[PDB]
Each structure stands twice: as structure tokens, then as C-alpha cells.
Design a protein around this ligand. Structure first.
Ligand SMILES: [Zn+2]
Ligand SMILES: [Zn+2]
Ligand SMILES: [Zn+2]
Lengths: 258, 258
């Protein structure tokens, strides 16, 4: 049967083509994950249909209702057969879905408006003039919520109680907030996204400091899936053949605007 | 049953303590992987015995007999229950053993004496005055053997027919060759090791350029092991607690002598 792929609209991973209204099916999209999906499918030998996750979330369990949302939920409840997106491999998720070895390595990072007097997480934690937040509902937020490290716990204490909310619905919302903040808002996001935005006009943001942690994105499938084994071997083969590195250059720097 | 852990003497992962002569069992060793093994055993609630791999190799398949050697071989043939070492997750190995998600991300890098006129892999492939090689029976050597990248394939043609052999039996021998070669030998090795050595006296070597690829080390178990699942979740939990980052600082820079 045709494999149902769930993904999310997050540049430069998945994006609508300028003339998508004129195209059909998979041809409507373009991006790092669109290219990767095509390759994984060829190497595993299956036909697929790309679908954008209904609720636009990555995946979190609701304490109380115990229901999983986002791409993770689509896999858990059988709405999708595989997820190809910048989905962070985490312990809680690994407990309900399967992940291939990572196709990209990254870490949480700090995005500032150029000129902002901030160079580290410690800098953010020791002051209050500059507000900071993260994407809401993702692994970055959870990182801070669960951290037992002094600096990060101190950061979470501030963020969870800040008003108005310092959290954002989407990356684009986070970046727009930094750009219009006049330097009074710093955004905490995954390094890969930070590096991408730094190469986009108006070229007014920059990544500062080292990453706060280290982790990776993996291709996910429902537990016990027939595709799990093959997809994992495909990711390793594609990394060993240099495809992954080629794709990142293609979508990050080959198209740089700064 | 006590779990038999196979490992390899490679600084700073597994090293005999200075006073090992008066110690017994696991107490004879210290290092990143020794601490990791203890961490894992504590969370999965099991007793273990650290054993140094007999042939001192990581693991490769004999092209003629199809027999696996090194730590991979010990797992494949059932001589060990788990391997905790700087063992690279690769496609060929993934087909015969199981790997947990990576506990450390790294890449192949260049080691030069210091003052050596080399800044990249391209620089090496352009001249013949400076020799260069890699370790044996490892993922690094296989990388060049299989690489289709113009530069990396050109480097391999040289390394393959190089006389005398530019390959070494151990990292120690490679670093030693760099130091005594008056800058006429450059060594290609895994970034983690390169960075560790750069912080070791005589402080006469240095890592130059960016990594040539991206990969990760993982804890391995034989296929169909009752330990695989639990250990994988253990690695994720440990990375999320910050222990893995705690451990690298401890053995890489906390003890740095430069
Ligand atoms: Zn292909
Ligand atoms: Zn612990
Ligand atoms: Zn042979």
C-alpha cells in the first residue's frame, strides 16, 4: 500500500512550492525532508504520500488525558506510517514510537538580534532586561522544564512564569519576535534552524554561544512497524554516501542570502 | 547472570589506573567508558565484568572467511553480552549487531604536528611531501576506501599504495608517528580523540579544519539481546540528564595538560 508520510511545514525542511496551486500530490512541496523522503522511499522501495500533520505540532503527551498530539500522535494512533521531519529523538517518544539512527545532529542554541549584549545561556540567566523563550510544545521547552542544571533551571523558572508569554506557536513567530524586539527578546531554538535563519534576509539575527545540549533528529515509525528496519539502514547508507551532507548544503548555504 | 562487557584500551575511554597492580576486576580501569558502563549497569540493575577485547580491534569482517573480529566479533559469536566503547555506528555493523542511539557525536578529522602547512583534506591531496594515513580495521579507513568524493578518493589512492604503509595498528602509534615525523606525517582520526590528544603534553599536535563527515558511537549488543532495548533507553536518559556532557568535560578538558 502507499505509505502515509506525516511531516510539518517548517522551513527549509518542508515548504509549499511557489506555484503549488498548479501542482498535485507530493509535487506541491519542496525542502530538505521532501528530498530525503524521496530517497528513503527509493531505497526502501515504497510509494508514499506526503501529508502535513493536522494540528501542526511535533508531538507531546497530555498529562491527564494521556493523548499524544502532533506527528507522534499520528504514528501512535495509526494515522500515518512514517514521520520524516525535524523530529527530536527523546526518551519519552522512544517509549511509544521507533526512531532510526539520527539523520542530523544538533543542539539547543541562542538566537539574538544583532548587537544584543548576550553571549551565553549564563548571560541570559543573570539578567532581566532581555526576555527569552522557546517554541511551545516541543523538545526544547521540555529540555528546560526537566533540567536539573542550575543555569537552565533558573532560566525555566523565569520563562514558565513570564507574562506576557515568552513562548511561541511557531519558529517563524519566534524569529519575527526577535527581529521586532529591538534586542529585548532572545530566542532559544535548535541549532540547525538558528543557522538557517542567520543566512536569510534581512540578515539581522545571529547564533551566539555554544549549544546547550546535544541530540538528533530521526525518522519515526509506529512501534513494531514493518518499515523500521529498512528505514534505519537507509539513513545510515545515505549518511555514509554523503547525501545528508549534500542536502544540508543545498538547503542551508547554497541558497544563502547573506 | 553477570553481564560480560567487551571494551578496548583507548584513552580516555578505557585506561588502566596508575596503581592497577594492586587492584582487581573492574577496579583496574578508569575512563569515560568505565564511568558510562557503571552508569548503565546502575539503571538497568545488572552486575558486570569489564573485559578487554582479545585482538584489540574494533571490528571488521574478513573478506575471505566472512569472519568478524574485534568487539563486533565478540558480540556476533556470543563471547560478550555488550560492547561499551568508542565503537562507530555503521551500516555493515548494524546488519549484524544492534546499536543504541549515539552517546557521542563526532567526525573524521586531521591531526598535524604543529607548524605543518596543512589546513584541510584538500591541502593533503594536493601534495606528496607530507604523508598521511589512518588506523586499521576501523570505520575511518573504510570511509576513504568507499568514498566517492573526488578529494577523499584521491587521498585513498595515495594511502592504498603508500610505501611504507601509512596505516597504524593503534591511535597511540598514529599520534607517535605525527610527533616524530618532523611534520612530514599527518594523521586522520576521529575528532573526539584528536581533541583529547591536543590537550595532552608535549602539546605539540593540533586538529585542523572541519570534520570530513558526521557519525556517532553507540553501545552495541547482539541481535536479539534482552539488553538492547533497556540500554538504548538508558543512553537517552543519560544524555538528557547531562551526564554524557558531564563525563566528556571530566576526561577531555578537566585533565587537560596544555
Ligand atoms: Zn539514492
Ligand atoms: Zn545516573
Ligand atoms: Zn583473511
Amino acid at each position: 500500500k502507499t505509505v502515509v508520510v506525516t511531516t510539518i511545514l517548517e522551513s527549509p525542511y518542508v515548504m509549499m512550492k511557489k506555484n503549488h496551486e498548479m501542482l498535485e500530490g507530493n509535487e506541491r512541496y519542496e525542502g530538505y525532508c521532501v528530498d530525503l523522503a524521496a530517497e528513503i522511499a527509493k531505497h526502501c522501495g515504497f510509494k508514499y504520500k506526503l501529508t502535513i500533520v493536522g494540528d501542526g505540532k511535533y508531538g507531546a503527551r497530555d498529562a491527564d488525558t494521556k493523548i499524544w498530539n502532533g506527528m507522534v500522535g499520528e504514528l501512535v494512533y495509526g494515522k500515518a506510517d512514517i514521520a520524516i521531519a525535524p523530529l527530536t529523538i527523546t526518551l519519552v517518544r522512544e517509549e511509544v514510537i521507533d526512531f532510526s539512527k539520527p539523520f542530523m545532529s544538533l543542539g539547543i542554541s541562542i538566537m539574538i538580534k544583532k548587537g544584543t549584549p548576550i553571549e551565553s545561556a549564563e548571560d541570559l540567566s543573570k539578567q532581566t532586561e532581555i526576555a527569552y523563550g522557546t517554541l511551545d510544545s516541543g523538545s526544547t521547552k521540555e529540555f528546560f522544564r526537566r533540567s536539573k542544571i542550575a543555569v537552565f533551571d533558573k532560566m525555566w523558572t523565569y520563562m514558565r512564569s513570564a507574562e506576557p508569554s515568552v513562548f511561541v506557536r511557531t519558529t517563524a513567530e519566534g524569529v519575527a519576535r526577535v527581529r521586532k524586539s529591538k534586542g529585548k527578546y532572545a530566542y532559544l531554538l535548535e541549532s540547525t534552524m538558528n543557522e538557517y535563519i542567520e543566512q536569510r534576509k534581512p540578515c539581522d539575527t545571529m547564533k551566539v554561544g555554544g549549544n546547550l545540549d546535544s541530540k538528533g533528529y530521526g525518522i519515526a515509525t509506529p512501534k513494531g512497524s514493518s518499515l523500521g528496519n529498512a528505514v534505519n539502514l537507509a539513513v545510515l547508507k545515505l549518511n555514509e554516501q554523503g547525501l545528508l551532507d549534500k542536502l544540508k548544503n543545498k538547503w542551508w548555504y547554497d541558497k544563502g542570502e547573506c
